[PDB]
Amino acid sequence: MSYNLLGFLQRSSNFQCQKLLWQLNGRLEYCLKDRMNFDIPEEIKQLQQFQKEDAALTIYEMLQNIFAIFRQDSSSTGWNETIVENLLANVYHQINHLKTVLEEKLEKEDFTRGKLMSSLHLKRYYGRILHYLKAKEYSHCAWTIVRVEILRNFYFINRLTGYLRN
Amino acid sequence: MSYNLLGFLQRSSNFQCQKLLWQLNGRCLKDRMNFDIPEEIKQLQQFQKEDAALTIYEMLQNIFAIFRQDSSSTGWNETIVENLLANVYHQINHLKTVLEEKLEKEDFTRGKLMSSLHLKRYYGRILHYLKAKEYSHCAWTIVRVEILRNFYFINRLTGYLRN
Ligand SMILES: *[C@@H]1O[C@H](CO[C@H]2O[C@H](C)[C@@H](O)[C@H](O)[C@H]2O)[C@@H](O[C@@H]2O[C@H](CO)[C@@H](O[C@@H]3O[C@H](CO)[C@@H](O)[C@H](O[C@@H]4O[C@H](CO)[C@@H](O)[C@H](O)[C@H]4O[C@@H]4O[C@H](CO)[C@@H](O[C@@H]5O[C@H](CO)[C@@H](O)[C@H](O)[C@H]5O)[C@H](O)[C@H]4O)[C@H]3O)[C@H](O)[C@H]2O)[C@H](O)[C@H]1O
Ligand SMILES: *[C@@H]1O[C@H](CO[C@H]2O[C@H](C)[C@@H](O)[C@H](O)[C@H]2O)[C@@H](O)[C@H](O)[C@H]1O
Ligand SMILES: [Zn+2]
């Protein structure tokens, strides 16, 4: 599969993922009190030079984590859990999809000195989100704040998707 | 190749560090001292991306050790110093990660030998001055200005951190 097909398949699932996220809530002003900056790594937003493999490996890791975030207990939200499952199934498919394509591309390359952009700061960034969730005892507001941050993640993954050009 | 992300991370670090250094204001015997900035540092030549990072790496390791010394007499906000050192530290690491990758592709040359020793001795004179001046507020002012000047060269070298 060319990078172009993967990139389109990504833009396409992101959009689907974002759509599902937008079918869970009804704005909560009260929750603005739990507002917290998680500081997505600066390179995810501003780095201008991404090689096809790096952007790909980066989105791969972001997805893996978004999956893990949403795998937590959202019961306190009252969200339609069906939609949550769709969101999860969708991301899971993108992850395994990306995995197979990277496996093919990377097979014969000089290592890849992989996630130079990814690993490092993404792991810590997501740790904050998780720690935040646990600290707030998975409250409905905590989920409202995270959901907004997750949507924000998707906004940047779309930016990253444009470096997947053939 | 990881030099683009490195240089990105380096510009980010250069900005924060300088911003912080400039911020510091406190509550003098001289106000200016010559520490004989190594020709190596004020040397206008084209540093290959690997040497630019080597020099930058050596410069930061030393700058770290300097701001690590006791500055309680300056009245400077320790929180800012804590941040500056944190930043410097985290960046010395990225540089290390990248330099390690082609650690074997570089050879022991006199340019490298003389650059490491001259830099070591320069920061050496700097550390010695703080010590002799018992880490006074007036020695620290002189040192901060020196380090800010160091960063002018760090900016220049960071421009070679690409491709
Ligand atoms: C939370 O969970 C759900 C939210 O997630 C999901 O639904 C969202 C709306 C959607 O955005 C998202 O993609 C999904 O994630 C939410 O909604 C319901 O959940 C499920 C969907 O998975 C649906 O429940 C039933 O599923 C079963 C499948 O085996 C079936 O029992 C049943 O099948 C039919 O399918 C349609 C479409 O889903 C339903 O409208 C009908 O109720 C049902 O049976 C028949 O279907 C047709 C309608 O298509 C009826 O008449 C036709 O209408 C046509 C109109 O153009 C005309 O040609 C003509 O008038 C006639 O042919 C027929 O009379 C009737 O027997 C599903 O009910 C469910 O549909 C979703 O509402 C939950 O509500 C939230 O709590
Ligand atoms: C000493 O330092 C901390 C400052 O921490 C920061 O906040 C200011 C507003 C920013 O410009 C700096 O970049 C950060 O270091 C203060 O909270 C404290 O009040 C001050 O005494
Ligand atoms: Zn880092």
Swiss-Prot record, chain A:
**Mind listing the GO molecular function terms for this protein?**
chloramphenicol O-acetyltransferase activity; cytokine activity; cytokine receptor binding; type I interferon receptor binding
The yes or no answer to whether the keyword Acetylation is present is: no
State which residue ranges cross the membrane: none
Mutating C141Y: what's the consequence? Variant found in a clone obtained from a fibroblast cell line; does not form the essential disulfide bond; results in loss of antiviral activity
Q: What is this protein called?
A: Interferon beta
Chief localisation class: secreted
Q: What cystine pairs are annotated?
A: C31-C141
- Name the PANTHER family on file: INTERFERON BETA, TYPE I INTERFERON
Q: Which Gene3D superfamilies match?
A: 1.20.1250.10
Residues bearing Phosphotyrosine?
Answer: Y3
Glycosylated residue positions: N80
Instruction: Tell me which UniProt keywords the record has, alphabetically.
Output: Antiviral defense, Cytokine, Disulfide bond, Glycoprotein, Pharmaceutical, Phosphoprotein, Secreted, Signal
Extract the InterPro entries matched here.
4_helix_cytokine-like_core (IPR009079), Interferon_alpha/beta/delta (IPR000471)
CDD domains, per database record? IFab (cd00095)
Give any single GO term for biological process.
response to exogenous dsRNA
Q: Name one GO cellular component term.
A: extracellular region
Q: To which protein family does this belong?
A: Belongs to the alpha/beta interferon family.
Cell location: Secreted
Q: What is the effect of changing W143C?
A: In a breast cancer sample; somatic mutation
What does the record note on quaternary structure?
A: Monomer.
Q: Which PROSITE patterns match?
A: INTERFERON_A_B_D (PS00252)
